[PDB]
Design a protein around this nucleic acid. Structure first.
Lengths: 252, 182, 125, 48, 123, 205, 99
RNA sequence: AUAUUCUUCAAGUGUAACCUCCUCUCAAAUCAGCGAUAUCAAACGUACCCCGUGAAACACCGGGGU
RNA sequence: GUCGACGUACUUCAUAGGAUCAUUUCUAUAGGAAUCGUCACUCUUUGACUCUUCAAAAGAGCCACUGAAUCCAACUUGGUUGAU
């Protein structure tokens, strides 16, 4: 290809690597709670105080968050940057954070999860590295003001190209544009592999599991003409509903 | 660099990264813009000739004045340098050292002549029409923008026939004739 | 849009602006049919580009001709010039090329004045 | 689809700001004095 | 990083991050280039004339001198661009003032290999 | 005539004149009368090259679609024409149809050969033939570009800074033996029939 | 005003072709549409056209008053220039009469 | 020091270092001011009938219309 | 016939007192202000980059597969109990 195509490919792989001070003051400045001026002037040490104080409240709501204070939200996990570590160790940082956003996604209306994930946003760079499991865990809150903030950070993946006009928009992403997401044949194959991952931990909640079907009904509805499109659709949908019946949960 | 301070100034009275005495005022760039010439080495390909005029002017000035060689020989040369059209008048013999400039030889360029004869609107736009292939000299169309044109040959530049730019001109006067397929 | 071709025709000081477009087969001169040209003896001097090549080739086209200048005769040499030029410059544009060289060889053998303006520029002896 | 009349990008001198010589880029009418007459200067009195 | 094609690339990339400062396509051949005093000012060795470029791709100077340049080097404590081409001569161009310091006849023919000494600034 | 004429030639009868205008078309006039016998159309059957430095398709450039020479055969029945194009022609004069079209040369080295250049030569900034390979060369004498700026068809071949164009300048028939020589860029061509490996019978029973 | 002959006006170069708008005869729809406020607005649209007439002519008379006194002042000014011209000649004799 | 190496001074219509003037200021074109042949609208002017105000004036009060 | 001599008439010739900038410190003068390893925010100027108007011109050309946007046809939903 050209030069500037290949030389912008290096930019994606070093999207988090703070090199100049101005590169740091753009990456560190974006976050969930604080605005762009007051975010850049605070340590990780400041953020870890508010997180570990908030995370102990979430441990009181349910004891499942107690384990992450041993590993991710521990005091020793301030010095570790992602970029310094090997390739095997990063996938364990993903598999902790992927296990975290399952438990986080249920208590998402509450104020302490907003202060809890933000240290896991700003120290662990989940708004760049793994924004699929960040967004797929929080895809059902599209009307809420917390998801409007989540859009205002993330460089959107190539699969979520329907929401790309709603990044840093005034009004929330409307209900039909959520269907244009699920109308794609590839974006469903995430939301299968998100859900069959979510059932195995048996943490699937009521408002989430409605918004799955309320999209999965409409995908059948928008494709009720094209009999070819439906023919390639049910290896995606019926294999969910096969595994969605295997659940212990009556609600699933 | 920095708009260095007053005490920085006096130690760096002479440093400058943009403008050098070697660079000679950037005269070569300054006339490349006014005539819009494509490749950079084109200037000093003329300025070697335009200097070689003056070196022949100088040694022909060092011959004694009542020499029927010397009186014959620069008037032999001003015949040619006026026919080619680099210099405006034939009368002065000291035009040959004073008025022979590169900007004189760089305005018998073809796109300047298409701007002098009011063919194209500007001088960049004439390069745009030469490179696309709308202009011609007699039979054959010309495609190098940097075609020198003799003052004698300056009569014969026209738009190339059946072109889409000689068709539009004839529509303005409501005088097309498609038996010519203009 | 509309496929048209504009050709000129010129005798002494008379122009002839013949627009030729694809149509039904009407042939007008100054907003009047060609069967009503003035001098009435020279009406067959303008039927020459109709009848030399054959009247079939006008079945799909329109010939709008408007003339100014000249006299009674020297306009009739302008409408026979601009109809011949307007016919033979529509077959090189919007119909087939081999039609055109059949026409340009037909008008040539009959009278070359149909195509190119016979300019009677002076001569000093 | 490359543009026509392309030329090597080079340094403007008449327009650029980094050059030293190109780095550079309410009326006032003083009232004639309230002392002064046409030429008489009616204020000056001894001591001077 | 600075790279030069033998045919026409000159790319003054930033390298860690993915930004691209200047990409000049030169239809003359090009042999070598170095950054002179920062990332900002670099100097390619063209077909005949060593040019001095800027971070945007601008020309700053067409060096009339340095009339062949196969091997081109800078040494940073003297602001002193050095060339040695296929002409034997060895020229040092003090790029702060623009005044050529010293032109040196090598007597040995076309310079096949040149590299500076960092400790000493002899070459 | 209709457009600029160039390169006339007269039949050895002394009664006809063959012309080559700039519209491509070759016309044949009488002399004792001013009228014309006929004209033969040459704009289509001319092959034209796209040069390396061009910006137009080879189909719609007006460089080479006329004929800068014509010569009647001594029979008075055939015209050979040749211009700044890549092709030579043999028109029959009464039947008004070309007989055979000769490509002068097939060289990538010369410019006016190809109707269609390769696409892999076109890099985003420019063709990969216009790049100066002159500085790569080992000797001194090759590297010295002394080409004057806009010198076309000039004095030496060094002073072009272009590849040489394809043009057939002047064409004549032979007097004797069905030959005709066309003077090219590559050098003077000679076409002939001295083979006679051909079965051209006449009145066979 | 000058009226260019049309045979001169026809073969003019494109830079200088004189723009002469033909009058319109077939009534436009817009000139059959638009509303003109009458009554009270007419008394306040006649008046603005009656004020701007006064202030254009009060300017173009007082602006003419300056160029009437410009002509008088430069006649008085050149008379002072002529005395400083001739007397400056006389000093450079009485200077060089010493030298 | 025992022909080269090193050193000192002198001279060169010697100089691709270094000083200096030229190699820019067009038989050019745009934009801005000015502004004509013209144009659209409005007002005002002339004549002509109509309506309000008024008791009324061929109203010397206002208005509408062609 | 033209050129001198004399007379007449006009044109022309000399400036001086200061101050600052000019040398990689120093223009000669002590009567003068400038030696600092920078971290932020605001504001202004210039440059690219993508579209683009006055306004075109030319397409390194042709095929094959896959993807998208617009415009009708169709269908569905809402719509005189009021769509635009």
């Amino acid at each position: 290809s050209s030069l500037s195509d290949q030389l912008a490919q290096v930019a994606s792989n070093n999207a988090t690597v703070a090199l100049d001070r101005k590169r740091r003051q753009k990456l560190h400045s974006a976050s969930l709670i604080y605005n762009s001026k007051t975010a850049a002037t605070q340590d990780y040490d400041f953020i870890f105080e508010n997180a570990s104080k908030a995370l102990e409240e979430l441990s009181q709501i349910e004891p499942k968050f107690a384990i992450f204070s041993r590993t991710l939200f521990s005091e020793s996990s301030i010095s570790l940057d992602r970029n310094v570590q090997t390739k095997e160790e990063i996938k364990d940082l993903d598999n902790a954070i992927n296990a975290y956003l399952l438990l986080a996604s249920s208590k998402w209306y509450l104020a302490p999860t907003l202060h809890a994930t933000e240290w896991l946003v700003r120290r662990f760079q989940i708004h760049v590295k793994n924004t699929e499991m960040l967004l797929l865990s929080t895809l059902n809150y599209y009307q809420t003001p917390v998801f409007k903030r989540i859009l205002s950070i993330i460089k959107l993946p190539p699969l979520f190209n329907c929401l790309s006009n709603f990044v840093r928009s005034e009004k929330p992403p409307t209900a039909l544009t959520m269907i244009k997401l699920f109308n794609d044949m590839d974006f469903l194959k995430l939301y299968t592999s998100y859900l069959d991952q979510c059932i195995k931990h048996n943490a699937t909640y009521t408002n989430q599991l409605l918004f799955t079907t309320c999209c999965f009904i409409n995908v059948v509805a928008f494709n009720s003409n094209n009999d070819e499109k439906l023919n390639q659709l049910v290896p995606i949908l019926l294999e969910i509903s096969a595994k969605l019946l295997a659940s212990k949960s009556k609600d699933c | 660099v920095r708009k260095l301070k007053h005490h920085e100034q006096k130690l760096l009275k002479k440093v400058d990264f943009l403008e050098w005495k070697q660079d000679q005022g950037h005269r070569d760039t300054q006339v490349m813009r006014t005539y819009h010439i494509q490749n950079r080495e084109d200037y000093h390909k003329y300025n070697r000739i335009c200097g070689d005029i003056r070196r022949l002017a100088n040694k022909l000035s060092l011959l004694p004045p009542t020499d029927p060689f010397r009186r014959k020989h620069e008037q032999l040369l001003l015949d040619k340098l006026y026919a080619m059209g680099v210099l405006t008048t034939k009368s002065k013999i000291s035009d040959l050292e004073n008025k022979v400039t590169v900007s004189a030889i760089c305005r018998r360029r073809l796109p300047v002549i298409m701007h002098r004869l009011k063919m194209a609107e500007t001088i960049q736009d004439a390069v745009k029409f030469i490179e696309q292939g709308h202009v011609r000299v007699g039979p054959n169309l010309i495609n190098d923008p940097a075609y020198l044109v003799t003052r004698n040959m300056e009569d014969y530049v026209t738009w190339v026939d059946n072109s889409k730019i000689k068709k539009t001109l004839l529509r303005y006067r409501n005088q097309i004739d498609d038996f010519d397929f203009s | 849009a509309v496929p048209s071709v504009q050709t000129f025709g010129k005798k002494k000081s008379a122009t002839a602006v013949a627009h030729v477009k694809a149509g039904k087969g009407l042939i007008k001169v100054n907003g009047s049919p060609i069967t009503l040209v003035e001098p009435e003896i020279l009406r067959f001097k303008v039927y020459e580009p109709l009848l030399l090549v054959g009247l079939d080739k006008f079945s799909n086209i329109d010939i709008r001709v408007r003339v100014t200048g000249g006299g009674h005769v020297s306009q009739v040499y302008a409408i026979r010039q601009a109809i011949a030029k307007g016919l033979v410059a529509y077959h090189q544009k919007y119909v087939d090329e081999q039609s055109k060289n059949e026409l340009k060889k037909a008008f040539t053998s009959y009278d070359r004045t149909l195509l190119i303006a016979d300019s009677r520029r002076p001569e000093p002896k | 689809t490359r543009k026509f009349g392309l030329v090597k990008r080079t340094l403007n001198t008449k327009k650029d700001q980094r050059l030293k010589k190109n780095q550079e880029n309410t009326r006032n009418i003083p009232q004639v004095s309230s002392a002064l007459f046409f030429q008489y200067n009616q204020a000056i009195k001894p001591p001077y | 990083l600075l790279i030069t094609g033998r045919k026409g690339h000159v790319a003054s990339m930033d390298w860690r991050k993915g930004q691209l400062r200047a990409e000049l396509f030169l239809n003359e051949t090009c042999h070598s280039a170095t950054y002179l005093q920062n990332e900002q000012y670099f100097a390619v060795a063209q077909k005949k004339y060593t040019f001095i470029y800027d971070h945007e791709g601008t020309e700053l100077h067409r060096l009339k001198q340095h009339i062949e340049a196969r091997h081109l080097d800078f040494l940073p404590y003297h602001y002193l661009l050095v060339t040695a081409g296929e002409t034997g001569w060895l020229k040092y161009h003090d790029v702060s003032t623009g005044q050529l310091v010293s032109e040196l006849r090598t007597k040995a023919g076309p310079t096949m290999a040149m590299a500076q000494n960092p400790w000493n600034a002899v070459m | 005539v209709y457009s600029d004429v160039l390169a006339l030639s007269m039949r050895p009868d002394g009664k006809e004149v063959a012309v080559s205008t700039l519209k491509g078309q070759i016309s044949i006039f009488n002399i004792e009368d001013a009228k014309q016998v006929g004209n033969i159309d040459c704009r289509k059957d001319i092959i034209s090259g796209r040069f390396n430095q061009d910006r137009f398709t080879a189909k719609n450039s007006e460089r080479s679609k006329f004929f800068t020479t014509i010569h009647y055969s001594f029979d008075g029945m055939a015209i050979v024409a040749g211009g700044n194009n890549n092709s030579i022609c043999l028109y029959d004069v009464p039947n008004e149809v070309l007989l055979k079209r000769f490509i002068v040369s097939r060289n990538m080295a010369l410019n006016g050969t190809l109707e269609f250049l390769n696409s892999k030569k076109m890099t985003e900034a420019g063709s990969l033939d216009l790049i100066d390979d002159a500085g790569e060369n080992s000797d001194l004498e090759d590297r010295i570009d002394n080409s004057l700026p806009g010198s076309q068809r000039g004095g030496d071949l060094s002073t072009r800074k272009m590849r040489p164009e394809v043009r057939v300048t002047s064409v004549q028939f032979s007097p004797t033996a069905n030959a005709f020589a066309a003077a090219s860029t590559e050098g003077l061509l000679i076409y002939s029939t001295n083979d006679t490996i051909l079965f051209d019978p006449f009145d066979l029973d | 005003g000058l009226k260019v002959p049309k045979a001169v006006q026809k073969e003019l170069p494109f830079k200088s072709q004189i723009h002469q708008m033909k009058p319109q005869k077939k009534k436009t729809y817009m000139a059959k549409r638009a509303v003109v406020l009458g009554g009270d607005e007419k008394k306040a649209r006649s008046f603005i056209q009656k004020v701007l007439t006064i202030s254009k002519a009060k300017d173009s008379k007082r602006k003419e008053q300056k160029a009437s006194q410009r002509k008088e002042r430069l006649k008085k000014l050149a008379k002072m220039e002529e005395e400083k011209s001739q007397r400056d000649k006389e000093k450079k004799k009485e200077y060089f009469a010493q030298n």
